[PDB]
Amino acid sequence: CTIELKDNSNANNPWVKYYVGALMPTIMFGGVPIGSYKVRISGQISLPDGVTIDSSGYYEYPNVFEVRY
Amino acid sequence: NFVPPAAPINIVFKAAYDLRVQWDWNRGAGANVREFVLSYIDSAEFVRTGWTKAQKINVGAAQSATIISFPWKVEHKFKVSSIAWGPDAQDVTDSAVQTFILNESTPLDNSFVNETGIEVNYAYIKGKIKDGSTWKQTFLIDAATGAINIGLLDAEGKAPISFDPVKKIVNVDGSVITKTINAANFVMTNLTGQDNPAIYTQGKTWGDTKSGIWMGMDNVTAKPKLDIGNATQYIRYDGNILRISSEVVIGTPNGDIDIQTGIQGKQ
Amino acid sequence: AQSATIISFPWKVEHKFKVSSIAWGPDAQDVTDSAVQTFILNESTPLDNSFVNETGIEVNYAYIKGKIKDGSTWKQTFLIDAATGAINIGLLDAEGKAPISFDPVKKIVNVDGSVITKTINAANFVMTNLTGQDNPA
């Protein structure tokens, strides 16, 4: 699964991917700026054909939080 | 293949008695400069011998140099040599020799005299540079505390190098180059907001084809990292998984052999 | 330094002197003291004006420089540039080289020896090869 982020303080910001890896019960990542963010998570599963990959509808956490500084 | 530092491109002169010499330095894809030395000798002495027993003035990598009470109507020669941290063979590169003599025909430029400024005070010792109508502090030495700030102040007032005997700390922003260091605690710190503390050989990165060592905290993934070895033979560790490419041996032969009695076999 | 100077020492007054020897190590033996030797300033004490010539301090708007007479010539040992606060310390050997210097413009402090500190907090313990013939470790 891949995880994106977007700074919610501004009215409109582009969603940015920050974590790419296997889905886990707990995910740890860093190296992100200070602004408050909204988080959407999507999963991608590879079809038997290498080229084709089935993604998921982005699920977004309703809560919005500041990065712990 | 070590590229020696490039010598100063050009030399100019300003006079007042006092003589000022400043050399422009430009460099690209070469050794970085760490110190500048100027050697001045009399032309007749230069003919007698080459830069031998020639008085020299050293500066902490400062372009401009000042000579006070230069001889009047006497020929002289100068050279400016850049200094780097490479081996002694190509450590230093010297610029082209430029002759010069104090002459009544040389225009007198006393502006440099006013453009600087120093003061000795019971409170402290302070150096200033005249910038327009104001003066900017260069270095300070307080009497009450042995604090010595070195360098022109930042717009926000952050001094480049700072000291504090009160806290017994030496505070330097930037880099420190030493032949060796002795200490009791190499406590790496995430000084900047997004820094990545680590110890490594210069020009080495984790998961790279270089032949260095890397050890530190990867703030991007928030996991410790490690790598010892070249591209093929290496000991690479990530918080999730450890990989050891090279052949591994555990224990030693006869590790648990009886000391009192040996072993043997027969048929 | 192997020598010291006392300015305006009282005359006709006895004094006692001890020279310490501080070294890194256990606090119990951190210091060692020289033998106690007293002194008096009096006409019976010969005057030696030789030591005045060797030392030299130069203070100017341009910079502050300390100089030592070797072979009837001033030799620069440390210079404090008034402009930009460029500072270099130590006698010059062979081609002019200062063992210790500080460069505010490049934010680099160069030392040609060892630095000793109880603790060091650095975000990059980069392990360089300066001389090129010594494998760093």
UniProtKB/Swiss-Prot annotation, chain C:
Organism field: Escherichia phage T5
Location of the protein in the cell: Virion
Section of the entire sequence shown: 277 to 413 of 688
Quaternary state and interactors: Homotrimer. Interacts with baseplate hub protein pb3. Interacts with receptor-binding protein pb5.
Function per UniProt: Together with BHP-pb3, forms the central straight fiber, bearing the receptor binding protein RBP-pb5 at its C-terminus. Upon RBP-pb5 binding to the host receptor FhuA, the central fiber reorganizes and undergoes structural rearrangements that lead to its bending, bringing BHP-pb3 close to the host membrane for anchoring.
Protein's name according to its UniProt entry: Straight fiber protein pb4
